[PDB]
Structure prediction request, 342 residues.
Amino acid sequence: PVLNLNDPQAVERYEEFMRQSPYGQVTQDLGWAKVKNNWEPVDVYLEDDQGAIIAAMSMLLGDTPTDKKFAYASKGPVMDVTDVDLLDRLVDEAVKALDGRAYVLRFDPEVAYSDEFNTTLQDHGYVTRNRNVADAGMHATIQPRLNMVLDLTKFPDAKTTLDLYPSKTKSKIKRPFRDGVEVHSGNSATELDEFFKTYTTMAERHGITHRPIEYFQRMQAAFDADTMRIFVAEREGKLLSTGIALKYGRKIWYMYAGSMDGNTYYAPYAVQSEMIQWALDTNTDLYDLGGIESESTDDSLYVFKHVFVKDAPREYIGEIDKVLDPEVYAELVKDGH
Amino acid sequence: AXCXX
Prediction:
């Protein structure tokens, strides 16, 4: 069925499924639609025999330079996507709800790439975007497909961040604290302002684009202090670096960060250590430092994240596209050919 | 446009 966003009991039943699923993702929560307020939300689900939700897909529809919308279910759907017959059923529900308004329904679930799962999806009529568009770099897909994820379940007895690391890394983590960096956290306007100062400074320094403060205020308003937390690193009252982490499903995800110019006294490492500490204190399975471009010492995103993640990066299946208007799909999407 | 998110 399609979710009636005006019926709070239905909405609460859908949220409860999302929040409790092992496949839950913050970008599939209905609060993500509040963040992405320039997109239109359409959400669908399937039920088992007893009427319980068993699978759910939160879509956001975006404008394009054609008469069709782009429908996108970021890191969804919420179910086991390798159960391709069940995926088809949920997708058919999504397609009915879209009602011919979109040219594509794209979803990019955090499930590993394999040849067998790629070929299955393609057998089932989806167009996939992964290794065939890899030469175009990290932005070949909307979300990075290579991600640095720390599996905390390999350290069932770890009590503190340093328990996860070899002595050479323990040294790197201890350094900012020894040098007087202190980290506070919370989810108020005060921490948001400290984050935004460091975020806009970093964006200017790197020459990259950046989102307006209202994006993060809508995120703060949507997510409570047990789900969203901003960590702020200072030394003797001087602001140095910050990061925002979201706890949802099986992971705490380091999503946004900023740092001031010049010497930051390794404050970004102190922010990582505290986010990791949050994941341990809440018995969370995974800590996700998110994307990189390549598993290479030429990639500065990988050099930083490999301090914390010694395993290989996860490589996901990438974008799975249910093509609905093939003429518009061919105009707007390139297959890496 | 640029890390997603």
Chain B is about 0% helix and 0% strand. Chain B touches chain A through five residues (CB under 8 Å).
